[PDB]
Amino acid sequence: EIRPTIGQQMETGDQRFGDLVFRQLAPNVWQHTSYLDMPGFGAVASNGLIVRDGGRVLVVDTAWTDDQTAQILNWIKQEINLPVALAVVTHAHQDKMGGMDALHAAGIATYANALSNQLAPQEGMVAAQHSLTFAANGWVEPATAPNFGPLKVFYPGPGHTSDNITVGIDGTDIAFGGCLIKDSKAKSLGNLGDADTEHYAASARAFGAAFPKASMIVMSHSAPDSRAAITHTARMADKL
């Protein structure tokens, strides 16, 4: 008989759900966190977003696996119970696109950088259903991003990967750097095996310039931070 809203519940603090963690960042915006078990070592965390936009939900990034992504969808059903209209996934690595099959089975329309949709299938991953094309200035061509609501998608240039994209949430102070940006105390940029080391620093800067009003920077592999994360990341990336 105690029936708080999800917002009221998330005041208590971050919530464990199955093998995931959820955190409310602002009303109508939650961070999902999933973990890749690496035998003998600590599990690798990855963050994405869930946005309630009127009577629908929008997702940024899958979890590492289909099952973890199904757990995200279970949380949305239990706590929000609105249809998930679409998902945007932010490059062709496992932490961002490892759960595409779960999204597709749920009837969710999926979008990724056209380049991610080329890169993913040859890695044994599944492409998104729709491809985003970006103008030379980095902004998504609106015709390729129909019905995105508050999501503003920006290609900052090659960095963490050649295909990495970023997402601002209009009406909030939040911008999602995905795996491009690490927090202002990070001692490394993580696995740079697919990175463009020449352009990384400039791409981090371009993300900051694209979303100048975003005071909360959300990231895949760090907890949310203030804007100092952006220049810290660019400093770490300088002259790799």
> According to the binding rule CB under 6 A, does residue 230 interact with ligand [O-]?
no
- Sheet with 151-154, side-by-side order of all strands: 151-154, 166-169, 174-178, 216-219
232 binds, among ligand [O-], Zn ion, none (CB under 5 to 8 A by kind): none
Q: Round to whole Å and give the CA distance between 40 and 182.
A: 24
Q: Round to whole Å and give the CA distance between 162 and 183.
A: 21
What does the DSSP 8-state code read for residue 221?
S
CB 83 within 8 A of CB 102: no
Q: Round to whole Å and give the CA distance between 233 and 47.
A: 17
Q: Round to whole Å and give the CA distance between 82 and 147.
A: 16
State in angstroms the smallest separation of the CB of 195 from ligand [O-]. 10
State in angstroms the smallest separation of the CB of 17 from ligand [O-]. 22
Site for ligand [O-] in 78-97 (CB under 6 A): 93, 95
The H-or-E segment that residue 110 falls in is: strand 109-113
> According to the binding rule CB under 5 A, does residue 95 interact with Zn ion?
yes
Closer CB to ligand [O-], 71 or 116, in the complex: 116
Q: Which of 176, 178, 179 is nearest to 195 (CA)?
A: 179
Q: Is 213 labelled as part of a ligand binding site?
A: no
> According to the binding rule CB under 5 A, does residue 163 interact with Zn ion?
no
> According to the binding rule CB under 6 A, does residue 232 interact with ligand [O-]?
no
The H-or-E segment that residue 154 falls in is: strand 151-154
Residue with token string 């491009």 = 180
204 binds, among ligand [O-], Zn ion, none (CB under 5 to 8 A by kind): none
Binding map of ligand [O-] across residues 169-208, x = CB under 6 A, - = no contact: ----------x-----------------------------
Phi, then psi, of 70 in degrees rounded to 5: -60, -35
Binding map of Zn ion across residues 208-227, x = CB under 5 A, - = no contact: ------------x-------
State in angstroms the smallest separation of the CB of 190 from Zn ion. 7
Q: Is 164 labelled as part of a ligand binding site?
A: no
Q: Which residues are annotated as a binding site for Zn(2+)?
A: 91, 93, 95, 160, 179, 221
Q: Which residues are annotated as a binding site for substrate?
A: 182, 191
Rule CB under 5 A: which residues touch Zn ion?
93, 95, 179, 220
